[PDB]
């Protein structure tokens, strides 16, 4: 027997062509940042109030 | 017991608790139930005067002859 | 690059630790006083 055998790539030898997830992409990954919109609005309120 | 004897023997005053209750027993405010609620009547009697029902479960006993608040 | 000197120093320290911890009994030190050396450690000269 081999005390320290080499690993046989029985699973990573096959490259899969598709992502593991079929879930749809949200709108926010294609549109600008709502969070920065809110932050900039808070900063505008602060600037307007002085 | 020793605490009680010490209190009975000492000259320090007895700190008397007023009968403060966590939950109020009568409605308060400036609303219809508040100004129509009778302090000397019971829950069922007040609700029967109001024309409203008090318990939504089936009666667990015998009601008064004129009770109309325990559906 | 092979850590040989570091192993040598650590082994020397661990041997000293064992020697002292055993030498703090005085029966062990009587025993090492009376014990003899072997010849399979002097081997290498000619035999």
């Amino acid at each position: 027997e081999d005390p320290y055998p080499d690993t046989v790539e029985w699973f990573t030898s096959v490259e899969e062509k598709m992502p593991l997830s079929a879930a749809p992409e949200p709108k926010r990954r294609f549109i600008p940042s709502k969070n920065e919109a809110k932050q900039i609005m808070k900063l505008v309120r602060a600037i307007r109030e002085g | 017991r020793e605490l009680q004897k010490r209190k009975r023997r000492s000259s320090r005053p007895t700190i008397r608790m007023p009968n403060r209750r966590k939950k109020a027993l009568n409605p308060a405010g400036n609303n219809i139930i508040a100004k129509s609620w009778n302090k000397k009547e019971t829950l069922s009697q007040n609700y029967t005067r109001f024309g409203l029902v008090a318990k939504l479960g089936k009666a667990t006993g015998g009601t008064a002859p004129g009770n109309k608040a325990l559906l | 690059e092979d850590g040989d000197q570091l192993e040598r120093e650590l082994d020397a320290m661990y041997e000293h630790y064992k020697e002292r911890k055993a030498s703090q009994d005085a029966k062990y030190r009587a025993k090492r006083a009376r014990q003899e050396v072997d010849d399979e450690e002097w081997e290498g000269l000619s035999a």
Partner: protein, 104 residues
């Protein structure tokens, strides 16, 4: 060929387990393949190896027969001379005599 000498109670217990028809060769290999197997021992420093040796001794049941066998094997040849056993009997008889006189 190396000479194998059994001196430990665990090895004597396992030897009894082979000698009596309790577990066979196939077994001994089968529970040989355990969590303590396939552990490196060759190129390791002595402090590391000794700490694992002291804190990682597998626990197995031992038998009174195996314990007696190890005791008999490791008994010295001059362990029980007639002189020593006779003086032991004399010592214990003196001890009971002294106990009786203390009772007196």
């Amino acid at each position: 060929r190396p000479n194998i000498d059994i001196i430990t109670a665990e090895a004597m217990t396992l030897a009894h387990q082979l000698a009596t028809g309790e577990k066979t060769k196939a077994d001994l290999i089968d529970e040989g393949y355990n969590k303590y197997a396939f552990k490196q021992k060759e190129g390791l420093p002595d402090w590391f190896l000794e700490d694992e040796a002291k804190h990682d001794k597998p626990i197995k049941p031992i038998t009174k027969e195996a314990a007696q066998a190890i005791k008999e094997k490791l008994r010295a040849l001059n362990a029980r001379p007639i002189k020593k056993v006779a003086e032991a009997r004399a010592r214990r008889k003196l001890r009971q005599a002294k106990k009786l006189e203390k009772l007196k």
